[PDB]
Design a protein around this ligand. Structure first.
Ligand SMILES: *[C@@H](C(=O)O)[C@H](O)C(=O)N[C@@H](CC(C)C)C(=O)NCCCCNC(N)=[NH2+]
Length: 214
């Protein structure tokens, strides 16, 4: 597959503004939802912000603000769909599953073979990817540049790959986070790409998944 040297889905209008999950352990929902939002736009839909709150409240295979799985949200969006953020706003606490108009359903999801950054690049050239990484102190304190700091000890935070590029010959991934616009580079982090460890920088390549429509 012919792969461009750089991709930034924000320049294609496929990312809503950065969100802030707050103190709630809902990264699984933010990571799933951003990938669905972007794919809806990429396939020809209108860019719409979709409700992580509905995932926190309704995806009983996951644990609300106590953690969860991107794949549980994809399965739920396949069967039952997802409402807009406008109709089902994020409050950062679990409540009852509230009935709201559904914006869309998806058809399923796929994984990428683990520990293969060039395979992650092939999918990232086509859509936003959900990934899970090992966050520790150095990642928490990231402000700008290409991150190459130390990592946490466990896979503990779901984020999204929204593109990739290089600066002065150093390749990176563009990673969307859910810690508000005041963290990092307007809410994003560039993480070193094509590392010696095939799991990627703090594990970016360990468990990539992405939704599919049709
Ligand atoms: C992430 C966050 O809010 O920063 C949030 O704690 C979360 O969703 N964590 C997930 C893992 C990330 C998506 C990588 C999590 O805790 N998953 C575990 C759920 C329980 C699964 N049980 C077993 N045995 N795996």
């Amino acid at each position: 597959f012919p792969v461009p040297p750089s991709v930034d889905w924000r320049e294609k209008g496929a990312l809503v503004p950065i969100k802030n999950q707050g103190r709630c352990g809902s990264c699984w929902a933010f990571s799933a939802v951003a990938s669905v939002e972007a794919l809806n736009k990429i396939k020809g839909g209108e860019l719409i912000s979709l409700s992580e709150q509905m995932m926190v409240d309704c995806v009983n295979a996951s644990y609300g603000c106590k953690g969860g799985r991107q794949t549980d949200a994809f399965k739920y969006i396949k069967v039952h769909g997802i409402a807009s953020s406008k109709d089902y706003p994020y409050v950062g606490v679990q409540g009852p599953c509230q009935p709201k108009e559904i914006v869309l359903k998806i058809s399923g999801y796929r994984g990428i073979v683990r520990n293969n950054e060039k395979y992650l690049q092939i999918i990232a050239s086509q859509q936003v990817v959900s990934i899970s990484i090992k966050v520790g102190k150095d990642f928490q304190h990231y402000k700008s540049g290409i991150f190459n700091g130390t990592c946490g000890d466990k896979i503990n935070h779901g984020v999204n790959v929204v593109g990739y590029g290089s600066e002065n010959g150093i390749p990176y991934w563009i990673v969307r986070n859910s810690w508000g616009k005041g963290w990092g580079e307007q809410g994003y982090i560039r993480m070193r790409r094509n590392t010696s460890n095939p799991a990627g920088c703090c594990g970016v390549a360990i468990t990539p998944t992405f939704p599919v429509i049709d």
